[PDB]
């Protein structure tokens, strides 16, 4: 079947592992445990077609050249994580020597009340790149399916 290489990127503690674990395990992992590099391979049905999903959960260059699609993650209560976004985007495009890389912007921890980044700012930044913006919460599962689904669709469109 068709195989999709997805890479989840973002600053330390934005919820890269929590989002990945909520997606494929259906539970919220409320614990501190920073990542070096974890990967998961699962079969999933997208728009009626079974495909292989490869998800690389990264730490906050060989994975940027391997990946076919990137989930750019920030935390709504972490301003520095939002500022890092344009840097991750620029690194991926430089590594892949391309300005045609499937990407999705993700604003995580939406369930929290202590936001420091206005959602309007994330929507305008995503629109400036021509990429989708999804508000997510790895705790409530809000937008989690939408974020991974939207990115698989973008990789598939690029593959055809």
């Amino acid at each position, epitope marked *: 079947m068709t195989e999709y290489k997805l890479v989840v990127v973002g600053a330390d503690g934005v919820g890269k592992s929590a989002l990945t674990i909520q997606l494929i395990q259906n539970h919220f992992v409320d614990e501190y445990d920073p990542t070096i590099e974890d990967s998961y391979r699962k079969q*999933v049905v997208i728009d*009626g077609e079974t495909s292989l999903l490869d998800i690389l959960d990264t730490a906050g260059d060989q994975y940027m050249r391997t990946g076919e699609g990137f989930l750019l993650v920030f935390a709504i209560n972490n301003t520095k994580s939002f500022e890092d976004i344009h840097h991750y985007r620029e690194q991926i495009k430089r590594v892949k020597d391309s300005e045609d890389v499937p990407m999705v912007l993700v604003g995580n921890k939406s369930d929290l009340p202590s936001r420091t980044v206005d959602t309007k700012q994330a929507q305008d930044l995503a629109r400036s790149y021509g990429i989708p913006f999804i508000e997510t919460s790895a705790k409530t599962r809000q937008g989690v399916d939408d974020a991974f689904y939207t990115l*698989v669709r973008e990789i598939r469109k690029h593959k055809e």
Partner: nanobody, 116 residues
Framework: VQLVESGLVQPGDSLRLSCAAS????????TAWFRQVPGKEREFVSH???????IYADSVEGRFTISRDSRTVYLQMNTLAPEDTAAYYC??????????????????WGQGTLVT
């Protein structure tokens, strides 16, 4: 959508199960077979997606064959062993994003069939 399913057999013998569907937009549905040993967890058996791609559990890989009438899904069971005695269920979903081996992905289910 509504699902309708179609007994005792010797080790090494064959049997066919059928899952008949009825309702709106039957062509958008992917169908899975699950089975359950009494007192145990429900386990994935095989699935045919909306586009016709088949997948199987490693335990039945090559032994069983799922197929579909271009309105019924079939589960062809051959070379049966004691470990295949279970209650068999078909399940279906028109979801555009789901993990096919997870029972929580399916909102429509057959009544079950007992295989010994």
């Amino acid at each position: 959508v509504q699902l309708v399913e179609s007994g005792l057999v010797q080790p090494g013998d064959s049997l066919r199960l059928s899952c008949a569907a009825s309702g709106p937009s039957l062509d958008l549905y992917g169908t899975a077979w699950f089975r359950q040993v009494p007192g145990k967890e429900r386990e994935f058996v095989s699935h045919i997606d909306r586009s016709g791609i088949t997948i199987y559990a490693d335990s039945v890989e090559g032994r069983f064959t799922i197929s579909r009438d271009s309105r019924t899904v079939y589960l062809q069971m051959n070379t049966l062993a004691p470990e295949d005695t279970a209650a068999y269920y078909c399940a279906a979903t028109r979801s555009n994003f789901y993990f096919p081996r997870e029972d929580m992905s399916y909102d429509s289910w057959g009544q079950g069939t007992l295989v010994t």
